[PDB]
Amino acid sequence: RFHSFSFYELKNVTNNFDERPISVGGNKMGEGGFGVVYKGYVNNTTVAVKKLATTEELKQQFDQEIKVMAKCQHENLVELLGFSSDGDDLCLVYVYMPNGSLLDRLSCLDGTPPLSWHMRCKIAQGAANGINFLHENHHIHRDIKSANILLDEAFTAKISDFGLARASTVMTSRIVGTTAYMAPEALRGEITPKSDIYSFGVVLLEIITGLPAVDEHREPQLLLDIKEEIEDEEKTIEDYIDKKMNDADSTSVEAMYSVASQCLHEKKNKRPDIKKVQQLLQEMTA
Ligand SMILES: CC(C)Oc1nc2nc([C@]34CO[C@](C)(C3)C4)cn2cc1C(=O)Nc1cccn(C2CC2)c1=O
């Protein structure tokens, strides 16, 4: 049900893959670990075009993205419109997300207004609903992070990047992911949906605090260490709450923090499963 583009077609609608950032006059919107994401236009639809960038491993991920996207349709997952396998360079074409990534909105990149606490609650709920869909359908995402949660015009959260996804224990020799988000067992090469939960907990800390998961010029460098600072009585969650908010109440903030803390159990089998995380976040706003 996806459309088969040709590489030249996606080229001409992206200003010939103009790699300059959008803010500077080009078409580059961002980049990840596996390619460059370009803004484009086909017919009357604005689209995002990921031009993928070992070469054998890249092709397998490209095929996995299509396979997963074909079987996984949900309002909290990004939508694939088509692809281009013509020639050597591979492209995936997605529905455009007018509010970009959660990572960029939490940092207010390019001058966007800070996200309200009410919007942050709806985003956390939506991202949990998307992870719940993946796990119900026996997919492990393996790369949950704020850069992989995109936002549409109503700030509905949409999980992206299923190149590394796996069916759902199991150890692997190729260890992939973003270290500042990964569970300890994922860092050791275990593949388990329990690791998706841990990474989501880090995302919840980003939502609460507005801080990046890792910052070289901050103490602590790693966000997940603040749970230890709070736990050993040195600090409180209120000391870290994003100050770029005036609609956050301590009761629901602490409720979200409680979920993140539960997700961030170092021991995998003490973590809640995604259905419980889903319920806890629903109980937050009731
Ligand atoms: C996050 C980047 C890579 O992407 C974007 N960035 C965007 N920024 C803005 C603006 C507008 O005004 C600002 C001030 C700039 C915020 C909009 N915006 C849309 C996208 C976008 O649609 N990206 C994706 C769509 C589908 C899937 N994927 C994953 C699969 C690769 C995407 O990355």
DSSP letters along 5-22, please?
E-HHHHHHHTTTT--SBG
Q: How many CB atoms lie within 10 A of CB 221?
A: 13
Specify the domain boundaries for CATH 3.30.200.20 within the chain: 2-96
Helix/strand/coil for 129? helix
What tokens does 253 get? Answer: 């903030």
Q: Give the CATH class of 97-285.
A: mainly alpha
The residues, ordered by sequence, that sit 6+ positions from 145 with a Cβ below 8 Å of its Cβ are 103, 178, 181, 199, 202, 203, 213
Structural element, H or E, at residue 159:
strand 157-159
What tokens does 21 get? Answer: 């950032």
Q: What gap in Å lies between CA 47 and CA 55, rounded to an integer?
A: 25
Name the packing angle between helices 193-209 and 274-285 (round to 10°): 30
**CB of 231 closer than 6 A to ligand 1?**
no
Nearest by Cα to 184 from 269, 277, 281, 268: 268
Residue nearest to atom 9 of ligand 1 (CA): 100
Q: What gap in Å lies between CA 189 and CA 212, rounded to an integer?
A: 24
Distance 34 CA to ligand 1 centre (A): 15
Specify the domain boundaries for CATH 1.10.510.10 within the chain: 97-285
Block residue for tokens 């990921």: 50
Distance 152 CA to ligand 1 centre (A): 9
Residue nearest to atom 18 of ligand 1 (CA): 100
Block residue for tokens 């908010």: 245
Q: What gap in Å lies between CA 161 and CA 198, rounded to an integer?
A: 17
Do the beta carbons of residue 204 and residue 229 sit within 8 Å?
no
**2-96 maps to which CATH number?**
3.30.200.20
The residues, ordered by sequence, that sit 6+ positions from 278 with a Cβ below 8 Å of its Cβ are 125, 128, 129, 132
225 a catalytic residue:
no
The phi and psi torsions of 84 (rounded to 5 degrees) equal -135, 115
Q: What gap in Å lies between CA 142 and CA 191, rounded to an integer?
A: 8
What tokens does 81 get? Answer: 């419109």
Q: What one-letter code names the amino acid at 218?
A: R
Nearest by Cα to 133 from 57, 83, 74: 74
Q: How many CB atoms lie within 10 A of CB 46?
A: 12
Do the beta carbons of residue 238 and residue 252 sit within 8 Å?
no
**Calculated CA dihedral for residues 128, 137, 166, 224, nearest 10 degrees:** 20
Cα distance from N-terminal residue to C-terminal residue, the chain: 38
Instruction: Report whether 137 belongs to an annotated binding site.
Output: no
Name the packing angle between helices 193-209 and 117-136 (round to 10°): 170
The structure's method of determination equals X-ray
Q: Which of 19, 22, 31, 37 to mutate to test the pocket of ligand 1 (most atoms within 8 A of CB)?
A: 37
Structural element, H or E, at residue 106:
helix 102-106
Instruction: Report whether 23 belongs to an annotated binding site.
Output: no
Q: What one-letter code names the amino acid at 142?
A: R
**CB of 149 closer than 6 A to ligand 1?**
no
Q: Strands 80-84, 45-52: parallel, antiparallel or unpaired by DSSP?
A: unpaired
Distance 101 CA to ligand 1 centre (A): 6
Instruction: Report whether 195 belongs to an annotated binding site.
Output: no
